[PDB]
């Protein structure tokens, strides 16, 4: 948590790399329970953390210490293994590449999604950041497993505001929070009132 020290000052633990668990208050709904791994703290907005929850494919951005929907936030002593990946070479060249990522439907039929591998994830470094042309939010998977099974085939504005023209005719405002290193025209965007991380080529 943020610990008052007091009037103009607050202290907080460095929680990047830590396992956490907390409740989440769905708006006018029940409390849901969550556990995951803190991957990063965003430089342009240091109260925003990027989180990977166990069993949930999207990477989320939450202001863990300030968002009032978060309750009973617990930072665990658990130590996340720093694994030395199966093949650093194969991982590192996969970065910045367009890919065809095979999923399968309930129907058992094939469903092939065009994507882009963006980076190796921080902290959980055998996992990769990836986004999709038809679903431009940030996802995270152990893509070396997909690759070896043959289910994966290989082919600054940070700080600025963005406005997105919603289909309604509404306008969604957000902030550019990260520049992809392997591809500096591609950025992560956090929209207010949405906890997904959007990924767009801003050129």
């Amino acid at each position: 948590g943020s610990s008052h020290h007091h009037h103009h000052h607050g202290s907080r633990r460095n929680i990047v790399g830590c396992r956490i668990q907390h409740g989440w208050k769905e708006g006018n709904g029940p409390v849901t329970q969550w556990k995951g791994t803190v991957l990063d703290q965003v430089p342009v907005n240091p109260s925003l953390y990027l989180i990977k929850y166990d069993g949930f494919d999207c990477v989320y951005g939450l202001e863990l210490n300030k968002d009032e929907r978060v309750s009973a936030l617990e930072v665990l002593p658990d130590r996340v293994a720093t694994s030395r990946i199966s093949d650093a070479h194969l991982a590192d060249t996969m970065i910045g590449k367009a890919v065809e990522h095979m999923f399968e439907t309930e129907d058992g039929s094939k469903d092939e999604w065009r994507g882009m591998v963006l980076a190796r994830a921080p902290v959980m470094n055998t996992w990769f950041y990836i986004t999709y042309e038809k679903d431009p939010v940030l996802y995270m998977y152990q893509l070396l497993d997909d690759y070896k099974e043959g289910d994966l085939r290989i082919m600054s504005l940070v700080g600025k505001q963005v406005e997105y023209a919603k289909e309604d005719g509404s306008k969604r405002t957000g902030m550019v929070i990260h520049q992809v290193e392997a591809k500096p025209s591609v950025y992560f965007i956090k929209f207010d009132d949405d906890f997904h991380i959007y990924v767009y080529d801003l050129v």
Binding site: F56, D57, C58, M102, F103, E104, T105, E106, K110, D111, Y141, D146, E149, D151, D194, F195
Partner: peptide
């Protein structure tokens, strides 16, 4: 192959 998840919100 992986299956696509339903996700909240």
């Amino acid at each position: 192959a992986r299956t696509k998840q339903t996700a909240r919100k």
